[PDB]
Amino acid sequence: GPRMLGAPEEADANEEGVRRALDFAVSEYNKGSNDAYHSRAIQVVRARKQLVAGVNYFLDVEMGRTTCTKSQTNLTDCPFHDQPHLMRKALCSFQIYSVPWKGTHSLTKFSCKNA
């Protein structure tokens, strides 16, 4: 049947918009963590998108603590931590409002838990 206009829909996590909403979520996550280590994304458990005045991205992602610190320069390689007390996990829900023609991203709903 013909879907409804403006309704959320499942999203491929490899899109040029989902990746960019994810990298935005990670950036705000690290700024909202007392954890020393920088955190990066492990996987995207679920990615939904919704067309509005711009795009709403609904991302359920598994986050993980890396060995590299919060303020390293060449923040391009950051492996997950090996030792049991070096590593940490979390399952996070982000709702990101993007306006492509304004070039803006905005985190409107956020919620992390252990995993």
């Binding site: 879907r3 206009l5 067309l51 509005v52 005045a53 711009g54 492509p100």
Partner: protein
């Protein structure tokens, strides 16, 4: 059925608005169609409340989306729709607050445009007024649109996903076009408006789900 026509010049179209983060394009598209028929039958241009429709059209999902056909059914069965002034837009879901004494327009039903027929849409736009239409607005080339007549080969002309309002048709620099009003603010497109390719084989599925209300 003229070859050029712009219902903004005739005083049928309210200023462009911004739906924000709410999937309420169907409410803006249908409200603007009602604004057009209110002008044709009364001579007054009064902005109507998409929030009314988002909140009270119980067969749609409010900010989770909806159809323009259902919005018209609501105004018919419900027996009215409030004005934007009496029921302003907030861009979020909430309980119905329809104020019957502040109703500003009614609706005696709706008639759908035949699927695929751009001549029929042209005919309808000419005799009726602004028409609610559905398109595939998901491409980046549509998000970053600025000038000219929009055409993109990758536009899904089978599954549409966004409601807008055809406020006229014409030609520009040799290519026939539709004149569509969007609800993404004046900062999108061309002061909130765009030109979509006309008679280019149902570009973006513009006739796949077009409708208008009867007053």
């Amino acid at each position: 059925v003229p070859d050029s026509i712009d219902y903004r010049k005739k005083g049928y179209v309210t200023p462009v608005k911004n739906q924000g983060q709410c999937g309420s394009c169907w409410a803006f598209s249908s409200a603007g169609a009602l604004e057009g028929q209110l002008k044709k039958k009364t001579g007054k241009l009064l902005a109507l409340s998409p929030q009314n429709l988002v909140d009270c059209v119980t067969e749609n999902y409010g900010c989770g989306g909806g159809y323009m056909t259902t919005a018209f059914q609501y105004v018919q069965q419900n027996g009215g729709i409030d004005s934007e002034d009496a029921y302003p837009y907030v861009g979020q879901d909430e309980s119905c607050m329809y104020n019957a004494t502040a109703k500003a327009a009614k609706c005696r039903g709706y008639r759908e445009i035949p699927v695929g027929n751009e001549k029929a849409l042209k005919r309808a736009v000419a005799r009726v007024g602004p028409i609610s239409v559905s398109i595939d607005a998901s491409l980046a080339s549509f998000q970053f649109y600025s000038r000219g007549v929009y055409y993109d080969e990758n536009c899904d002309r089978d599954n549409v996903n966004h409601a807008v309002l055809v406020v006229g048709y014409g030609t520009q620099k040799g290519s026939k076009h539709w004149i569509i009003k969007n609800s993404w603010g004046e900062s999108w497109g061309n002061k909130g408006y765009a030109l979509l390719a006309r008679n280019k084989n149902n570009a973006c599925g513009i006739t796949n789900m077009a409708s208008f209300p009867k007053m």
